[PDB]
Paper text:
Cellular respiration complexes convert redox energy into a transmembrane electrochemical proton gradient, which is used to synthesize adenosine triphosphate (ATP) or to transport various substances. In summary, we solved the 3.3 Å structure of respiratory complex III from the hyperthermophilic chemoautotrophic ϵ‐proteobacterium [name] and revealed the structural basis for the hyperstability of proteins in an extreme thermal environment. The two cyt. b protomers bind to each other mainly through TMH1 and TMH4 to form a stable dimer. Several residues unique for thermophilic bacteria were detected that provide additional stabilization for ligand binding and for the structure of the whole complex.
1 complex from A. aeolicus has been shown to use a 1,4‐naphthoquinone (NQ), as a special substrate, to mediate electron transfer.9a In our cryo‐EM structure, several NQ molecules can be clearly traced in both the Qi site and on the cytoplasmic side, but none are around the Qo site. In particular, a well‐defined density map for a NQ is clearly visible in the Qi pocket formed by TMH1, TMH4 and TMH5 of the cyt. b. In the structure, we found density for two 1,4‐naphthoquinone substrates in the Qi site of cyt. b, around Arg222 residues on TMH4. The tail of the 1,4‐naphthoquinone stretches towards the membrane core outside of the binding pocket without interacting with cyt. b. Importantly, Arg222 residue is replaced by a histidine in R. sphaeroides and B. taurus. Compared with the short histidine residue, the positively charged side chain of Arg222 is closer to the oxygen atom of NQ. We find that a residue unique to the thermophiles, Tyr61 of cyt. b, is involved in this dimer interaction. The phenyl‐hydroxy of Tyr61 in TMH1 of one protomer binds to the nitrogen atom of Arg197 in TMH4 of another protomer enhancing the interactions between the two cyt. b protomers. In our structure, this WF‐rich TMH1 binds to the hydrophobic surface of the TMH region of the complex in the phospholipid layer. Importantly, this kind of interaction leads to the formation of a deep hydrophobic groove, which traps a phospholipid molecule.
Author numbering:
A (entry chain D), F (entry chain A): 8 to 75, 96 to 121, 131 to 170
B (entry chain B), D (entry chain E): 7 to 401
C (entry chain C), E (entry chain F): 3 to 238
The structure:
């Protein structure tokens, strides 16, 4: 049969063309997810030392401390989005770590001890797989 | 001459049929100009964007150095054609709101105008995207962040709902769609530029053409409500030219005077001053509500305590305009003929202006209570149209 | 008539809506800073001539390049960080486009505009002691006037500790025992205004043409109205 | 369903009038497909440019890093949509040449089709500019220099003519118009990008619409030459649907097969390999003749020893197509009916193909002699149309 | 019939016109360089595995960064001049976008693509001994394969004095007493080919889909033709 | 009169709008002529010394020599577009001046003495106004 074969063929062609157009225009596929893995080996960071990284955008901290807001209890390894709050500077490590733009101080868990910023740093989600933080 | 062009193009046979023997209604009121005014503003936007596309550059390191340095100081009359553009965008939103609301008034969505209203709602939806994606382009301090705020709204859908909390990481209109995915980069800016500048205006021209044809196919609804008196009732039509063609031609010129007032003498609110700061993704401005044409929905949003339900209300308030021809069903048409529809329409108009006005103020708990009280009145206009319809069916 | 009540309601509500939606929304509490009124004429007319044949804008430019170009890079006028002096090329700043600063409506062949990415890679990515010591890069003063206003610019400079609580930018013009700082800050703000505001010749041509365009469209509309009125009489 | 849309849009009354009762001629031949094919190629160019505008960047330091790096390797299917674009440009030139030449053949420019040919010549002129300004955009080693070569051609006009040598520094289409003035800078590239991408396609859509309306207003000229037999002669029309609508629908699919052959398997001549080198304004390539659709004129140029007279001949060869309806005046129409017009048309076609083929070879004195011999034959077709017209008027 | 002569003339002329206008114009005398045929298999399949688990493309990349990255900056793969090593940032090359090289269709997080203007301002405008000694900047080898061809690339390298009369680029792989240079140059050209040519997985998907699209459109056209033929019989 | 007053007014409005559109789009006015003056003081260049400049594009030389193609006779001051011929390098001054890319040599008047380039450097036009070259 023809008067339905041409309809099915035109429908398949339209579907393929729309798939191509979507794949070009509306697809940041497999390059937008940069990065959801963010391999951060825990056995490389030393105690009381912060590694600068980037998760879901810039920036991200990797804090490790042996002893002791406070969303999480003692895990000794975590990650905080490191950008100052009220005007968006980058705090420097070192025991609190502050940003020198306005004088905002931060405890290694995020909260402020001397605050020009109103609110602390929001903890981004994390996963623990052996010795790799997400 | 004209007879030579007449014999080859039939220009006079088109003129005498489209203008002299068209026979529009005589009692047409003033808000019947808003369609022509929206068409004129569309033409203004096209004409003034053809000039801006010559010098705007869709790069992160070059945007806001074209539109602010080049367009404004380096190019002759570039200040004027960015002023005209940023003024015509807001005028084109305002005229379209007035048009659709005084088309709701006279109920220009009933039989046989169900399809013209669907095409008009598509016009409105794609116009939201054309004015929303064209605002990221200047790459100003609040342009970037108002794009972010508006593109994270579909993200509250993924937040754990009251029912079936699997919506996490599904319908990811953040990563896949605009915001480019976890970062607004140069590729995303180029994509938004290209779309806003050529993909959306083309499907605007197509849809406006379909809409204008569907208006003629169904005829202009007269504001009285009888909707016709066919084969009789003369002396109340006084055909299109010169009765209407010169009334619209004067309203267009006066509207353009009101337009070029804002273009030249008051633009400190269409080019906001704190948008003249180059955007940095590390510092967030204080008050970053979206543009004014989306504030009536942004106030229904972020007022309900739940974010998922707030987004669902956002979407229902926009979907209740597609169904609005199918929602109201009655033999009566106009608002001069329905004394119960007039009060609901005035409630709707007042409580919809109040939502856009509350969307500008900072989010205090009293502001949330007020935006919820007014959201209830906005939804009442939609959940009462079938009630008035059922009442009027029994007369 | 009842139609009149409908008219002055459906139009009054829309007018009072667009009024407080497009200018003077009385429910937004943004603060206002104003010039100290000590001078307030250095900033009104930055192109006003002075002694030594120099206008106020040119003198503010020199004050800026001498006391402020050490950390701030006012592009759109060719002012970059003084470390090195000048921070752009050194050697060939012309081989960047890199074009000479051609504002409204006169170009300056002695100063060049370098793109944002060429700069801050040649200049600030061989990083000097700005991001390290201060903490943040002194962002840019190119379009800071249009973004802040003369009041905020004046009240910020000469007392950055009052507008912002803590800021590593110094006083750098300390009043209350130096009575010569207020006019210096006024000249700096007047210069920064002369970069983004048309001269008295151009800001007047825009006013004249904007008046003429409105008077053109109003007259055209009323002419079309009178023409329709006249043509409806020959027919009925 | 369809009856619901019928009652509100009158879709069946439009279908039965535009397709079932249109009554086109029956003896329509094959070259009557080239208009539909040019329309389809225009649609292809629009669709595939909407994809390219998302990632192309009109900066000197970023062009050829978008179109070659981003478009080709970084973007999925971007290779395909740049291939489709650069192939459809050449196919759109070729189909338009075939269309206008087999419209010259059947003399579709006589009464009452004088105005459709003027609108078609405007189509052709603005299409030259759309394909000429869109070639600078990839910013390749020969793209920049072929833009320079083509924009210095209006400069030979300023060269001292045989008469009135004041043309120096007047009609400066170099400085004022394209090439931006003494330097092709980033602003000029942005201007050419914006124009080519949105200003020219809009006045292409408008002119194509006017052309398609003027074709219907004057009716399709049948290839025989009687031009009608009104109120009689049935059984030779067999109306538009399904006689013609499915013949064109099969020719379009076969043409798209021939098109996607070049798109996928042979594009080493539409994306020339030595254009994949980034343009530097200091090194000139060896053979830098313009694109193939302008070589028939470039061979009339630079073959006459004088440059001013060569440019005047360039312009006369293009102006003799506007006057071509006014130039040929006879009661006879077709080329099956004029045995003396057929030989002049075959001379014109052969000697116009030979000019475009000679425009590719390097400029040797023998090449110049040949390009002048063929330019004489091209001009003969225009300076003999009035002679054949005067002969046929006396029968 | 005479119409047949008209057909096979007006179509034959157009076909033989577009033939020698769009492929193999026999009157252009551009020269042809070819691979030496000594190997000619190092360049055919640069993704062909070898010993030590390395493909030919990866080995050519190392040969290029070791012996050619001293003066040539092959972007589109993250290769810049070795002075300094690496010539891009040093420190933050990520804060440029600056994105990692994501070609077809796999990205390489260890190499970054820097724009043409950010580079050559940070790198070559603190000019090292390339433009001075040589005279011209070694331009770029990013898209040189697509612009020259494997034959020209091979015959240029290992004998630049033959292709170009005088060129300050050295032999740098001297044959005729070093029998190990031809395969090195072949690996370099194979690497430069692997930057611009799809892998064997991608160059095959394109062929399959291009065959399927043509077979789709031909079948659709003939189906519409047969449908028209059938529908013209129910009517006449 | 009105039915012609509105026509004249609409024509003036269209003329002004077209003037504005032309002035924006099609006008490199007063910035494309960069540079037709090119002030080059002759009393600043020393004998046997070349100053690098730019006329009508890049680049341009400013050669001065006391004694002696050859389009012009002895004037001792002139200007040649300085870019090598067959591949477009920049010749360096110093008595001939060559480009080190391929080895092309050039006499101070433009012609080649050892030529990898086929043709010499074309002399751009010039004007003499006191001590200023164009
Ligand atoms: C220097 C100069 C400064 C200029 C300042 C800015 C300019 C302001 C001018 C705007 C004026 C608009 C005028 C509209 C009203 C026209 C007159 C009118 O009255 O319109 C009425 C209805 O129109 C209608 O719904 C239309 C009216 C209702 C529309 C409501 C618009 C709301 C705006 C947007 C709201 C946000 C929406 C958020 C998303 C839900 C007509 O009703 P009738 O029963 O037929 O009366 C008959 C009598 O008129 C007889 O003559
Ligand atoms: C894998 C596949 C590879 C594909 C390779 C590329 C594809 C090539 C396919 C192109 C085929 C084109 C066919 C055109 C001819 C159609 C048939 C024909 O013959 O067309 C004739 C005239 O058409 C006409 O002028 C039209 C013919 C003349 C047009 C000349 C075109 C010149 C091209 C441009 C020249 C440059 C111009 C420079 C500027 C002046 C018809 O004349 P009739 O007297 O009515 O005859 C009647 C008989 O046909 C009865 O049946
Ligand atoms: C691609 C995606 C699609 C969306 C695009 C949207 C745009 C348009 C929508 C498509 C158009 C809808 C189709 C409607 C066709 C029905 C017209 C019709 O059929 O109605 C005719 C009227 O035509 C008349 O006025 C003719 C009216 C004048 C036509 C003028 C328009 C032509 C120019 C448009 C092109 C743009 C350029 C504009 C600048 C001038 C009636 O025929 P008559 O000659 O009076 O009677 C004589 C009878 O013997 C024969 O019938
Ligand atoms: C799908 C198929 C794609 C491959 C299928 C999948 C699995 C393969 C997987 C796959 C293959 C790759 O090579 C690839 C390359 C790079 C990254 C990723 C991939 C990949 O994932 C071919 C698509 C290309 C075709 C060629 C579309 C043509 C492009 C546009 C220009 C067409 C626009 C269509 C419009 C909107 C409709 C207009 C209708 C008009 C009236 C004509 C009707 C004719 C017909 C359309 C019915
Ligand atoms: C001229 C006048 C310009 C000033 C005149 C000269 C000396 C002053 C000198 C002058 C003044 C400057 O401020 C200036 C600034 C910077 C550099 C240089 C200058 C300068 O040289 C005002 C022009 C601006 C007007 C506002 C045009 C509006 C802009 C477009 C958006 C309009 C597009 C028009 C289209 C193509 C026709 C559509 C017709 C449609 C049906 C409506 C009809 C209404 C009417 C047009 C009849
Ligand atoms: C000590 C280095 C330094 C000096 C010198 C300096 N600035 Fe600043 N500038 C800064 C820093 C640090 C900030 C804080 C940025 C922020 O808070 O976001 C700043 C901020 C600013 C701002 C914007 C603040 C805002 O929130 O809008 C302005 C305007 C400004 N300075 C003006 C000047 C002027 C004018 C001069 C020259 C008279 C000057 N500065 C000299 C470093 C400096
Ligand atoms: C001595 C510094 C130097 C070295 C080392 C060098 N190049 Fe070159 N390269 C040059 C110069 C100088 C040119 C000449 C540019 C011209 O003639 O336009 C050139 C030109 C080229 C060209 C293009 C020539 C043309 O006309 O298309 C290629 C391809 C090339 N070199 C390849 C290479 C490769 C591959 C390597 C590494 C094995 C290499 N070069 C090493 C400096 C160098
Ligand atoms: C049709 C309705 C349109 C609306 C409502 C609209 C809206 C907007 C808005 C709000 C802006 C921001 C300008 C600013 O903030 O200063 C903008 C910018 C822009 N528009 Fe549109 N636009 C429309 C159509 C078009 C069209 C047809 C073009 C065609 C070229 C276009 C080209 C541009 C460009 C290039 C910019 C960026 C230039 C700049 O920011 O100064 N727009 N648009
Ligand atoms: C670019 C946007 C638009 C243009 C150019 C446009 C144009 C027009 C014009 C010229 C008319 C006839 C004159 C008039 O009724 O005033 C009309 C009618 C109409 N429009 Fe629109 N319009 C636009 C947007 C919309 C939108 C957003 C809607 C609905 C959401 C809409 C719904 C209608 C309806 C229902 C009518 C019928 C009026 C009646 O029959 O009385 N339009 N349109
Ligand atoms: C209508 C007839 C058109 C013709 C004949 C034409 C012709 C061309 C040509 C020859 C190129 C060069 C491509 C290459 O050398 O690889 C090009 C590029 C381009 N075209 Fe068009 N064009 C047309 C319409 C359009 C339209 C409607 C758009 C809408 C967006 C568009 C957008 C572009 C863009 C952005 C480029 C640069 C992208 C690239 O170089 O890869 N063009 N065009
Ligand atoms: C985008 C470019 C073009 C499009 C979309 C287009 C479209 C069409 C179509 C569909 C037809 C009717 C079908 C046919 O005659 O084959 C037609 C007829 C015609 N076209 Fe075009 N055309 C284009 C370019 C041109 C050009 C460049 C010329 C002349 C220089 C031209 C002159 C004509 C003439 C004279 C007719 C009448 C044919 C007849 O009556 O037999 N067209 N055009
Ligand atoms: S930036 Fe850290 S305190 Fe304001
Ligand atoms: S470039 Fe000067 S010698 Fe070849």
């Amino acid at each position: 049969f023809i008067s339905i074969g041409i309809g099915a063929l035109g429908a398949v062609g339209g579907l393929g063309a729309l798939y191509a157009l979507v794949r070009v225009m509306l697809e940041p596929s497999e390059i937008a997810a940069l990065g959801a893995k963010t391999e951060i080996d825990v056995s490389k960071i030393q105690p009381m030392q912060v590694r600068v990284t980037s998760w879901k955008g810039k920036t991200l901290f990797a804090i490790r401390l042996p002893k002791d807001y406070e969303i999480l209890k003692g895990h000794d390894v975590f990650a905080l989005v490191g950008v100052c709050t009220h005007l968006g500077c980058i705090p420097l490590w070192k025991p609190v770590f502050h940003c020198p733009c306005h004088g905002g101080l931060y405890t290694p868990y995020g909260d402020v001890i001397g605050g020009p910023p109103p609110r602390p740093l929001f903890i981004p989600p994390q996963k623990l797989e052996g010795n790799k933080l997400i | 001459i004209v007879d030579w062009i007449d014999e080859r193009a039939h220009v006079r046979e088109i003129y005498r049929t489209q203008m002299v023997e068209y026979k529009v209604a005589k009692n047409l009121t003033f808000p019947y100009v808003f369609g022509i005014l929206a068409l004129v503003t569309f033409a203004i936007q096209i004409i003034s964007g053809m000039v801006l596309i010559l010098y705007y550059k869709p790069s992160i390191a070059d945007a806001f150095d074209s539109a602010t340095y080049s367009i404004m100081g380096e190019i002759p009359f570039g200040w004027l054609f960015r002023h005209i553009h940023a003024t015509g965008a807001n005028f084109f939103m305002a005229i379209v709101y007035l048009h659709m609301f005084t088309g709701i008034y006279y109920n220009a969505y009933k039989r046989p105008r169900e399809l013209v209203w669907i095409v008009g709602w598509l016009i409105y939806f794609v116009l939201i995207l054309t004015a929303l994606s064209g605002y990221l382009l200047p790459w100003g301090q609040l342009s970037y962040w108002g794009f972010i705020v508006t593109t994270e709204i579909p993200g509250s859908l993924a937040d754990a709902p009251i029912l079936k909390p699997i919506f996490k990481a599904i319908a990811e209109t953040i990563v896949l769609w605009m915001k480019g995915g976890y970062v607004v980069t140069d590729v995303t800016l180029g994509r938004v530029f290209g779309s806003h500048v050529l993909i959306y205006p083309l499907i605007l021209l197509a849809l406006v053409g379909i809409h204008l044809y569907l208006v003629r196919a169904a005829g202009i609804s007269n504001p009285e409500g009888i909707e016709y008196d066919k084969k009789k009732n003369p002396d109340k039509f006084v055909p299109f030219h010169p009765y209407m063609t010169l009334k619209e031609g004067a309203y267009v010129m006066w509207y353009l005077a009101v337009f070029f007032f804002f273009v030249f003498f008051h633009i400190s609110h269409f080019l906001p001053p704190e948008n003249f700061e180059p955007a940095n993704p590390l510092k967030t401005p204080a008050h970053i509500a979206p543009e004014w044409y989306l504030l009536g929905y942004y106030e229904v949003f972020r007022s309900i305590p739940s974010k998922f339900w707030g987004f669902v209300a956002f979407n229902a308030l926009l979907l209740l305009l597609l169904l609005l021809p199918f929602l109201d069903f009655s033999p009566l048409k106009s608002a001069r003929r329905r004394p119960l529809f007039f009060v609901m329409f005035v409630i709707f108009m007042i409580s919809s202006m109040a939502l856009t006005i509350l969307g500008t103020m900072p989010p205090t708990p009293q502001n949330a209570k007020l935006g919820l009280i007014f959201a209830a009145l906005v939804f009442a206009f939609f959940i009462s149209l079938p009630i008035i319809s059922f009442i009027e069916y029994g007369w | 008539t009842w139609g009149l009540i409908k008219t002055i309601f459906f139009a009054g509500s829309t007018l009072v809506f667009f009024f407080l939606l497009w200018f003077y929304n009385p429910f937004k509490h943004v603060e206002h800073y104003e010039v100290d009124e000590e001078v307030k004429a250095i900033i009104d007319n930055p192109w006003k001539k002075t002694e030594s044949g120099k206008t106020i804008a040119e003198e503010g430019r020199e004050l800026f390049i001498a006391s402020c170009s050490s950390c701030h890079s006012l592009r759109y006028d060719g002012i970059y960080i003084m470390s090195v002096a000048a921070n752009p090329k050194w050697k060939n700043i012309e081989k960047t486009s890199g074009r000479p600063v051609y504002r409204f409506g006169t170009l300056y062949k002695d100063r060049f505009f370098v793109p944002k990415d060429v700069y801050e890679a040649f200049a600030h990515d061989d990083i000097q002691g700005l991001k390290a010591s201060l903490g943040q890069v002194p962002p840019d003063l190119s379009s800071m006037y249009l973004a802040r206003g003369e009041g905020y610019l004046y009240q910020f400079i000469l007392n950055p500790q009052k507008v912002l609580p803590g800021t590593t930018m110094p006083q750098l013009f300390n009043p209350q025992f130096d009575p010569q700082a207020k006019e210096k800050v006024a000249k700096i703000v007047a210069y920064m205004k002369s970069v983004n505001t048309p001269p008295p010749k151009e800001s007047a041509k825009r006013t004249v043409m904007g008046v003429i365009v409105i008077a053109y469209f109003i007259v055209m509309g009323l002419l079309l109205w009178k023409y329709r009125e006249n043509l409806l009489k020959r027919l009925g």
